[PDB]
Amino acid sequence: GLISEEDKRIIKEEFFSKMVNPVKLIVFIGKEHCQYCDQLKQLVQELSELTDKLSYEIVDFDTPEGKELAEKYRIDRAPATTITQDGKDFGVRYFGIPAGHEFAAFLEDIVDVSKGDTDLMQDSKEEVSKIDKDVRILIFVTPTCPYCPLAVRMAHKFAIENTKAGKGKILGDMVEAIEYPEWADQYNVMAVPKIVIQVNGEDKVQFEGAYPEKMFLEKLLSALS
Fold first, then answer.
1. In the sheet that 23-29 helps form, which strands lie side by side, from edge to edge?
2. 3-state secondary structure of 194
3. What stretch or stretches form a coiled coil here (predicted)?
């Protein structure tokens, strides 16, 4: 009972009732960094039981088949969850448990991936549609940070539109800092959210705070230079 019966009802009528295409949550789990693996596994299961348009699959990252699946979905470590549209990679990932304020953002991502659509401004979709370089966006957060979801959701919408444009080169990765301290220490994460925009594997831009759509995009674009 990780999710109460009342919440299940609310999740179904407020979120999953808007789903269109089936969504599959592919969760990679290994023997490292997963103090909250049981909750993560129980979580994706409880959500999947809410609708026939949502399913999950727990993948063992510590095995050769698991590693290969990880490569196909561009996942380099576990725990990690990629929200796919019936297996199709949209670059919407969560590294760690989506607890606290990140829970609602997780639910919305499922819907947006189901619909394969976002509410970004037209100007922003047109720009994001032109991006043709491997872009990885890290969003360091904590379950307690109320603004963090905004940054996670913004990067994810960028990933979705870039997938819709037929590029599929933008990866939006929410990183739960409490579970990935070493990774967070790597970018001197203090205040959250902390955004790191990488192009072709190398860091190019870094900032703190949930930047509005136009400014977040401005930072993404400058990173591509």
1. 54-60, 23-29, 80-84, 92-95, 170-176, 135-141, 194-199, 202-208
2. strand
3. none
